[PDB]
Point group: D3
Chain length 319, copies 6
């Protein structure tokens, strides 16, 4: 295949994909602005990327399933603390980055990660939209947080729910591994505090990463003692805001079977809500990652789990 | 099509044959307890296999027989947590099932069907020492059951209600008998003084007005730790006719009870309900276990086992 | 107390039979007022699973089948064009309350008798004809006995099964679900017995097939037997044809929701090819051994059993 | 605001069509530079499920099908020897972003028109030919409409389905997945419509079959029809042949992952024998109604649907 | 070093002595009963690590044995043989693949252990080896042992969705996608009759042609049916070997396999061919049952057990 | 009518071959650890694939190979929660499976088979510094295992026992070796001083007497919250030969461990076992993980991972 046909087409296809996101973001931004009475609106951007996974790539299929579950007929549209999701200023959908089609053009991982970052900035460029990213595997948090921090001009504090620290300097030769985005984030200087919750699978090399970057890694084996800390968090003060990343496998596999990495002895769903509902600070973006529909039960319980996490994060981020 | 005159006569005769069946089963079990002595109250299972007042899935219509079988699953023994023997008929007994499907198939309307459920409950209460423990079925059945208990005893009860949902909608999709409204109906009839709800985590702002309008004590999951010592030391019924306990299986976390229509993540642990139930003080005069849905259960029927244990433990507290 | 026990048994059983009688009276009067009907397939549930040798979940089948007949994903027309919304094509009578009756301490002979009387109550109301929903396969004996007594003679039987169900003595249970057709042949209630789908048969039951002149069609010769099976003509010279369909005659890939999986079974289309072409006066039938507790989450075997009922009803109603 | 809302819909629809156009242009230029190709089956996903009558899960199918085409448990050669690693044999264009356009308030007529124009954008790039991935079966109408209009005449259609999909009015939805071939026959976009697998059909739709000269082959005559259906010759005298493959044409034991289980369907080899021997200039086709939300944990129906795509593409590419 | 290999050798010899004593037992039992010329003897090879997608067939042998002699399934084969008669079928045991692997033993030596285990069975007249896989790679060391022990070639009847004839599959000489390449290269087979084939690359079609393999594809099954249901194999060589890959069956009937290939054989297709096969059957195998991909009810274990029961009836005499 | 001289000869020779296999494997691993140095105890896995003493389902016979595979699942890493590296043979190693099926097929009775299991455990203990961590198999195997550990060490042990059931039935269905009686056999033999049970939620009144008779310390789920400070600070083994840890997988709630034979709702969370086991003080001399039933697990094999993690965390506490 010729080099010119490749270089040009890649840019044409990528330009078209970004234009679609830009038009959708303009549509929703204009809508919120014509409604008034809104300071921030959680805006869903799907990033259906699985190929940085180390075991199973099914989370690539997650974003459309999460969006549907948000409106399951078995549920109502009010959040636990009383916000109405039927209000467009509380939550709106922007769209999905077309990862598979862009990848199919022969685009490399660096450029792909750059398209993700540009898509996040398109959303942030429309006041009052704030990005709530649907994964996809956890690799997407690096290009998302990089974009948020670049757009805001400074660091954020990060609340990170995970069974895994995701701080590998080098996982299997993949800079963009879903096991490394937070090493990428701390290397770039995009985060101040990194508060990790649910950790129960961590190697000794990564324990040195935690020490090196001043990460606040809360392990399940101390959760009873750490609970008053985690349920009283005040992040962001002094920097540009707070970013909340929620890996669905932070929950016990009994609660969230639909994930690639089962790690028994995880969080209860009410643990995450307690922490998230009590969190103080200016949330400027977030993600819900690693829901894997291909490993879910036939009743789609993990789609509902992921949807409720999105609903409760949106209630905290919209203003 | 068919003569409405033919329908009305069929409806009366079929309803009368169904009530006569329940009466003879109740009279049977009544005479059996009274011949055994040493019994002041016997929890008596009445199935109400009704699902068509559900808003999402009707599979709980099939629950009551699956619950009764799980009470005697072969992987389990017959003793309750605090030592009561389920092989003792005075501890627990089965009356039977209201044949909802066949009555509905006569063209009976929803008001009449609710009246059949109420009359079935009164047939049970008529036989000393039986007390009704109702197996749903969706939660709409708590209205005609609680109405019956209250009418038969001649006064209000206090209600302990385990649920993810307050079930207090004034008007849910135009169905007065919606499973999302039975406690709005109960409060409108004044059948309950106190209504203590536990497990709540899905509530609309309109329904919050209902809670304050009727003085309901609605305990939400986000305050359960703060509320725990109150709830594990409950004392109900004093001054009125007794205590009624309604257990919605979806009050439990979906990881523990997947066999329900309405999955709501972040629910009660099975031990949460037992702590409250086993510690509850007051004269339990009836109760129900509702919304188990076999069609959404795991292949090994884990939620049937869950629902049976709830029935087992409520019976231990009601029988004496 | 022995007197309290007989009297309660009499009175519970009587009230149960009155319920069935009143339901059948209603549906008979309904069809007779509609007119233009010689026979209406009428569903009688027999939720009995305790004569099973492995798993008793088919006790729960009858209500699941009735629901799947009207599943929202299907339409109400049979493959050859009958409309199930026509009450003359199919109607529900009710379920015998087996659990409540057995809970009165009634023994198995009296239980079998209550099933027989319930069937006869359906047949008493022109033009209803009984289509029984099991329940395990033991119920076929009291049902066929009732049909044959009420009609005054023998019937021919078309019987779909993976197993002959012809054991003289299965683990000491006379009413075992693996013995009902031995009981039927012993009583002379049936003349011809044509079994289709057999792939699990002991050498001891092979001598029961010789003894009674059963026509046993085994899977291994299905291909050669296909012209005969797709042109069956039963009942001529006797009182009619009774069709018993054991759901586990179907391959487990099609019907996972059964107690006894036997690989290499019938395809669903094999049963329909035989049933839709069957000539003869069908006077009753049954669909048994659907076990909801062994079905898949989608309930495919409920739909399978419902479609067997729908297609049997299309042939029995006229 | 209406006039503003319309301008926003227009810009969003335009950006979506531009994305499909650049993807088709890209793949078109790739095939032409490779040479030695007359037709390349080109996958266009239409993730639409909201015209379904029972379950909308087939909205999620296209990306699962594409992944299964390259499952690590399979190899990349089709049964008759074509290599899927050759971009000339199969290639992906993209998915119409149905959800995001619907979310602008676009109504169903405009949505169908966007589908039609997307198909035309593929056909505009020689030598791409559209192989559409549903989505529910409603998409076949705007797809066949676009194929017929672009080619300038009628096509003959080979249609695998449990259901005729010929309802004049299914529940008030003109775009119902139970009516696309009514819409196709009304518009004159097809000459012959040859349906295979039919086993769920109402009497009003039997009248539709007669009214449009539809050749509806029901399962109850499959063995008799087999020499006809396995030597089909379509499209001569018209603009070509279009193949619509509804996955629920297969028995649910083979394809559980569909919204409408209908027991007694085709075996997979039945479809292959017909499709592999089909003669005629295939100008387009689709594979519809795979529902991953009702599939088994192993995703067998995704593999079933992928193999149908793979074999259809073997016949269409040349 | 040189010490390491002596330590592995003690583990291997202990494993082979276990097999030898079990075969010794069953061999003595048949000879004392009398009235028997051949007894199908089950040898498990719980090996899954030469699989290209999923290794779960490593757990198959004990699941299959349980389904042969289990509950709610009678004990007579289709054409009438008594499975409670030890002369019709008997269990020898399982090669302890996992423990030998855990000693650092390489794949060539592991395959040698498999061959020698087969030969210990053949040594105890009248037992004949019926091997339970495990993935299909085990057919190579098994057939090599059968042929070496009999001193000549065998004709092979092979049921499979896949020809398993890759000369080189992903650089693994012992790949489960290559055992019949290894068999043909080794000169252990004369005829190779393959049935059920519906997944074959053009490179492998060249292998088929080069070795004169008789590869019957599903797309021509109907017209091949007369030839296939009157097979006569083994005349002039040392006997017939029957290899049954469970994924030859349609995945609707046999979902418990690693490689789902839609459009497979019906259960009756295999049994018609197998039961009408003429020729002296000297060994066989049933491979690629994967319990970790079976239904919760284990229907494929039942499928695999029935295949084993019908092969045993044909091999025992 | 099968010659007994032939059977008995097969029994002795097959059992000898089987024990010689375990001996050589133990010698292989023991030599390896001695050549590596810096080790005082290495947890060594011994499988006992026995399910025929189960009262409901025998599927746990298939567990040991599944558990070992899940210890190295590609989705996990090889570091335990508190930092030990399973890739280090001194931390965990495999010995092998007792071939229960092949020995039974020789006509060996249940006493002789329990004896084979005991001698296999002693074969592991002979090789310094291996310590037995037994993979079941149903819970009947704990009796011959603890018998062997006690005899080899010459005295009693204290036991930490995780279970939904006390397993203390004197006579369960006429089977002396029932999986519901191994701790009655242990206590009759005097191989245990203290028996601390955790997770108990299914206990009959008869067995309540058994607990009294042997001084068992039976902590029921009913009191878990009060008992948590005691159970998460356990000091066992002082004054005797060591501590044996028996983990029955059905101690965990069925929502976590569906792949067991006996589902009993309201059980332990996985974090409950870890909190107790990671904080346990005492010289652990052996352990087992029993009753994982792969045939009742979900298709993702979650209970295999659950069991594997329990083995991984027990090995971390036993190896040193
Ligand atoms: N009984 C359950 C009612 C559920 C309903 N979605 C609600 O809004 O509560
Ligand atoms: N994001 C999940 C990474 C999982 C990997 N096995 C690890 O060792 O962390
Ligand atoms: N495309 C499927 C339509 C199904 C509908 N129940 C019918 O009667 O055709
Ligand atoms: N034994 C299975 C081999 C499967 C392989 N993907 C093939 O190309 O045949
Ligand atoms: Mn993670
Ligand atoms: Mn993560
Ligand atoms: Mn409720
Ligand atoms: Mn509720
Ligand atoms: Mn049968
Ligand atoms: Mn039968
Ligand atoms: Mn269709
Ligand atoms: Mn269809
Ligand atoms: Mn193979
Ligand atoms: Mn194969
Ligand atoms: Mn236990
Ligand atoms: Mn135990």
């Amino acid at each position: 295949v010729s080099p010119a046909l490749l270089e040009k087409a890649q840019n044409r296809v990528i330009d078209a994909a970004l234009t679609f996101i830009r038009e959708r973001a303009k549509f929703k931004g204009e809508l919120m602005r014509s409604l008034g009475g809104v300071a921030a609106t959680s805006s869903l951007l799907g990033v259906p990327l699985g190929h940085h996974s180390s075991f199973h790539e099914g989370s690539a299929f997650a974003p459309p399933r999460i969006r549907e579950a948000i409106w399951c007929d078995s549920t109502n549209s009010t959040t636990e603390e009383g916000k109405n999701l039927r209000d467009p200023r509380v939550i709106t959908n922007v769209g999905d980055v077309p990862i598979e089609e862009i990848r199919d053009c022969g685009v490399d991982d660096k450029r792909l990660a750059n398209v993700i970052s540009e898509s996040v900035k398109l959303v942030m460029d429309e006041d009052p939209l704030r990005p709530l990213v649907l994964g996809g595997d956890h690799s997407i948090s690096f290009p998302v947080v990089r974009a948020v921090s670049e757009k805001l001009g400074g660091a954020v504090d990060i609340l990170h729910f995970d069974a895994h620290p995701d701080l590998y300097h080098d996982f299997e030769g993949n800079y963009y591994s879903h096991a490394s985005p937070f090493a990428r984030i701390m290397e770039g200087g995009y985060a101040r505090r990194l508060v990790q919750v649910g950790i129960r699978s961590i190697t000794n090399d990564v324990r040195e990463q935690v020490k090196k970057y001043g990460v606040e890694t809360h392990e399940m084996r101390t959760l009873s003692r750490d609970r008053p800390i985690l349920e009283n968090l005040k992040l962001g003060e002094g920097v540009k805001g707070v970013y909340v990343s929620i890996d669905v496998d932070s929950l016990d596999p009994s609660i969230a079977p639909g994930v690639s990495h089962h790690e028994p002895g995880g969080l209860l769903f009410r643990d995450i809500l307690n922490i998230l509902q009590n969190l103080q600070g200016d949330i400027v973006g977030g993600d819900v990652v690693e829901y894997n529909p291909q490993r879910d039960t036939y009743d789609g319980i993990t789609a509902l789990v992921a949807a409720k996490l999105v609903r409760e994060l949106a209630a905290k981020m919209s203003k």
